């Protein structure tokens, strides 16, 4: 159908501490650890933002979630994160900007641009397919139905212990939220909107 605002206007359709979580300047941000949660639940649908990076930020988007407090076993994640900053040596694909989190690489990396540029992503959520689109890039495509294993991915590589649910039995239906400040990188959005498939 048509676009709208993720959190509609002043994030009037957002769960959130407004503590933690302010627009400035057109500008969404956070300056504690928390979540911001959709107040309702999507399926179908294609996810538009803007976000821009410092060095070493690590973040995500969080699709599909069916419990917002206990929510990182119970989600899908679309990592963003400074592929620029090289801290943890090579580092792993799924840990990537684009990738998701934990289960599947992107296809290239530094698609991400430098910190201090703007990006801008696409996902889209068709019930167990998400795509992941950055800088105008298809970087990733999942089917949800390979991942039969909470343990290991089907790129050979071990899911982290604290994601042991399998992908493929994941529910496709559930709040979208992004992701706190957890150390000194900072992370911005802009433009968050959503619309249905
Ligand atoms: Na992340």
């Given at each position: 159908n048509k676009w709208k605002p993720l959190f509609g206007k002043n994030?009037?359709?957002?769960?959130?501490?407004?503590?933690?979580?302010?627009?400035?300047?057109?500008?969404?941000?956070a300056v504690k650890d928390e979540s911001i949660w959709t107040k309702d639940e999507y399926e179908n649908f294609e996810?538009?933002?803007?976000?821009?990076?410092?060095?070493?930020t690590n973040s995500g988007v969080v699709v599909?979630?069916?419990?917002?407090?206990?929510?990182?076993?119970?989600?899908?994640?679309?990592?963003?994160?400074?592929?620029?900053?090289?801290?943890?040596?090579?580092?792993?694909?799924?840990?990537?900007?684009?990738?998701?989190?934990?289960?599947?690489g992107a296809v290239q990396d530094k698609?991400?641009?430098?910190?201090?540029?703007?990006?801008?992503?696409?996902?889209k959520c068709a019930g167990q397919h998400?795509?992941?689109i950055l800088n105008g890039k298809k970087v990733t495509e999942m089917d949800m139905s390979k991942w039969t294993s909470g343990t290991?991915?089907?790129?050979?590589?071990?899911?982290?212990?604290?994601?042991?649910?399998?992908?493929?039995?994941?529910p496709t239906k559930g709040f979208i939220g992004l992701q706190g400040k957890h150390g000194d990188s900072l992370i911005w959005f802009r433009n968050i909107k959503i619309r249905s498939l």
């Open positions: 994030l009037e359709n957002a769960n959130y501490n407004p503590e933690v979580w302010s627009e400035t300047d057109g500008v969404l941000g996810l538009d933002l803007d976000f821009k990076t410092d060095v070493g599909y979630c069916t419990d917002t407090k206990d929510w990182i076993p119970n989600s899908v994640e679309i990592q963003i994160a400074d592929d620029h900053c090289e801290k943890w040596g090579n580092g792993k694909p799924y840990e990537k900007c684009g990738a998701i989190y934990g289960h599947l698609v991400v641009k430098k910190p201090g540029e703007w990006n801008h992503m696409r996902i998400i795509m992941v290991k991915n089907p790129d050979g590589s071990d899911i982290p212990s604290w994601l042991p649910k399998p992908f493929a039995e994941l």
